[PDB]
Amino acid sequence: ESADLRALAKHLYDSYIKSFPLTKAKARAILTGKTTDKSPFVIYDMNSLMMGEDKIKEVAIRIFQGCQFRSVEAVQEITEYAKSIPGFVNLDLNDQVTLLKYGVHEIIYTMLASLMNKDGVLISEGQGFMTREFLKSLRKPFGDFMEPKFEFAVKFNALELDDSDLAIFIAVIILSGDRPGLLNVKPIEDIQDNLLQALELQLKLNHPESSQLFAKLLQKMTDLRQIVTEHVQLLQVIKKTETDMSLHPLLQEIYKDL
Ligand SMILES: CCCCCCCCC(=O)O
Ligand SMILES: CCCCCCCCC(=O)O
Question: Where does the record place the region Interaction with FAM120B?
Fold first, then answer.
């Protein structure tokens, strides 16, 4: 019923606020220059990066490892959020692991869009702002790492979704019954059905003007999956070229293998 869907929407949003310290509302307040929030230190070159360390191996590797640490933190936040989705903790333990293993990256890039604009990305809980041009200036293959994410974010941000919309969308992503190696797909699809229903009512009530936003949002999955596929290919290159560079155990378990 409609009231039950509104209740599910409210639960997920409340639960999202508790799991993710830097929301899209806080991120937009920082980027647009609002009084609810302070201005970030901008990193656009090597000098601002060095000063930035004071305010906030080689440069390219150091930045990459910084992104790897934030990814670990994000995985932790997503795992805590997943546990609050009704029915998730009641699923087979191997399926819970499988849903998180494949789901987190898709959620990482969805939530990364909230911290981005066409010019750059908010870093270290919004204290910093690293420019896109600087990240693109990095030596190969590191220069190519964030560019497809910026390309996705520009398109995704045009949908003008808020945190309450994103809370249900990332729940829908987690409960994907088409992940490889799942043992019981039906209770997963059963939860996703209710999540899809809650998302549809949320988008119709929150964005009444925005025609077919529901379909438009579900279409963004292809782009998300593609981002994930490309990202995986890029780490394989690094693994072979930078044999002294170590990847966090949590990330190693998620990445190998997809
Ligand atoms: C809680 C999900 C937030 C995504 C931000 C993680 C950024 C990861 C990266 O720089 O690649
Ligand atoms: C020397 C660290 C360079 C920072 C790379 C980006 C880190 C992302 C973050 O702090 O959220």
Answer: 1-46
Question: What is the Cα–Cα distance from 15 to 61, expressed in whole angstroms?
Answer: 35
Placement of tokens 């990364």 in the chain: 112
Distance of alpha carbon 76 from alpha carbon 194, whole angstroms: 25
Check if the beta carbon of residue 64 is closer than 8 Å to that of residue 135: no
Alpha helices by DSSP H, 42-122: 46-55, 59-83, 93-114
Q: How many CA atoms lie within 13 A of 64 on its CB side?
A: 24
The alpha carbon of residue 167 and the mean position of all alpha carbons in its chain are separated, in whole angstroms, by: 11
Give the H/E segment covering residue 43: strand 41-43
Residues spanned by the domain of 136: 1-258
73: CA distance to ligand 2 center in Å?
Answer: 12
Tokens at residue 84, please? Answer: 């609050």
Q: In Å, what resolution does this model reach? A: 2.3
- Return the residue whose CA atom lies nearest to atom 9 of ligand 1: 67
Q: Count the domains in the chain.
A: 1
**Positive or negative: CA dihedral 209, 214, 219, 221:** positive
Chain centroid to CA 155: how far? 15
Decide whether any atom of ligand 1 lies within 6 Å of the 77 Cβ: yes
What separation in Å is there between the alpha carbon of 160 and the centre of ligand 1? 19
* 163 touches 76 (CB < 8 A): no
Using what technique was this structure determined? X-ray
Instruction: For residue 158, give both structure tokens.
Output: 């045009």
* Site of tokens 């994907």: 176
Q: Domain of 153: which CATH number?
A: 1.10.565.10
Pocket of ligand 2 (CB under 6 A): 62-63, 66-67, 70, 123-124
Structure tokens at 75: 């995985």
